[PDB]
Scaffold this active site. Structure first.
Site, PDB file in Angstrom:
ATOM      1  CE1 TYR B  14      -3.805   2.394   1.137  1.00 40.81           C
ATOM      2  CE2 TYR B  14      -2.050   3.428   2.406  1.00 40.81           C
ATOM      3  CZ  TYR B  14      -3.325   3.468   1.864  1.00 40.81           C
ATOM      4  OH  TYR B  14      -4.133   4.569   2.048  1.00 40.81           O
ATOM      5  CG  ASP B  38      -7.611   9.714   4.322  1.00 47.01           C
ATOM      6  OD1 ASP B  38      -7.478  10.667   5.112  1.00 47.01           O
ATOM      7  OD2 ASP B  38      -6.637   9.252   3.689  1.00 47.01           O
TER       8      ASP B  38
END
Lengths: 125, 125
Positions: B14, B38
């Site tokens: 990631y 997020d």
């Protein structure tokens, strides 16, 4: 109300209550019904009841618990990286978990998950 | 199938697909039916479609993302502590979040949360 400032307060005391052996203090950032799932996965200590004693079972050795990084707090939640170092019979150990603190909308903490595994423990032979 | 050992790889991949702007890599690591948060506080994106376009906008300004500690994973669940560094109008800016993923029996990141607040954004003037 609440506030990251307050959650970065409650986290500092939680570590201090721990880092002193202080057992009443560890129980006072929480609510009366809050849950504990440590290590994450296992069956969760619920109600102040199994909590204190969970914290009891672990505090039996002088645990040195410092914060290894800046606490991140947002929307009732509080995350933080840290260490747990302890000696027994001549060897040195170090648990490196990440707590995830879910605070209710009153100011207290309402669920504690703590992430670590065989990899996140550093004991010598 | 799963295992803590797999998650550290998905974490690592990631971080990689972030630095190098490898979008397919990024979206690959997720569930075809996963959500993004997020920061924690914001409304959830969902469906690969909603995720790519999000991650598209995170990579307009180059990202020098870096893991700041050992990633911690137990019980199909994985947390980490990192920084996302990036520049705009000459200003050095860094983010310092703690993220949490949650897998499934398939090993595909079925939930991404990013946790950091105002105190955890490090840029001068």
């Amino acid at each position: 109300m609440n506030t990251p400032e307050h959650m970065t307060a409650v986290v500092q005391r939680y570590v201090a209550a721990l880092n002193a052996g202080d057992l009443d203090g560890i129980v006072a950032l929480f609510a009366d019904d809050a849950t504990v799932e440590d290590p994450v996965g296992s069956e969760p200590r619920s109600g102040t009841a199994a909590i204190r004693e969970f914290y009891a079972n672990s505090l039996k050795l002088p645990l040195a618990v410092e914060l290894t990084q800046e606490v991140r707090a947002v929307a009732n939640e509080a995350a933080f990286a840290f260490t747990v170092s302890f000696e027994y019979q001549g060897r040195k150990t170090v648990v490196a978990p990440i707590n995830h603190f879910r605070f209710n909308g009153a100011g207290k903490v309402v669920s504690m998950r703590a992430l670590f595994g065989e990899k996140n423990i550093h004991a010598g032979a």
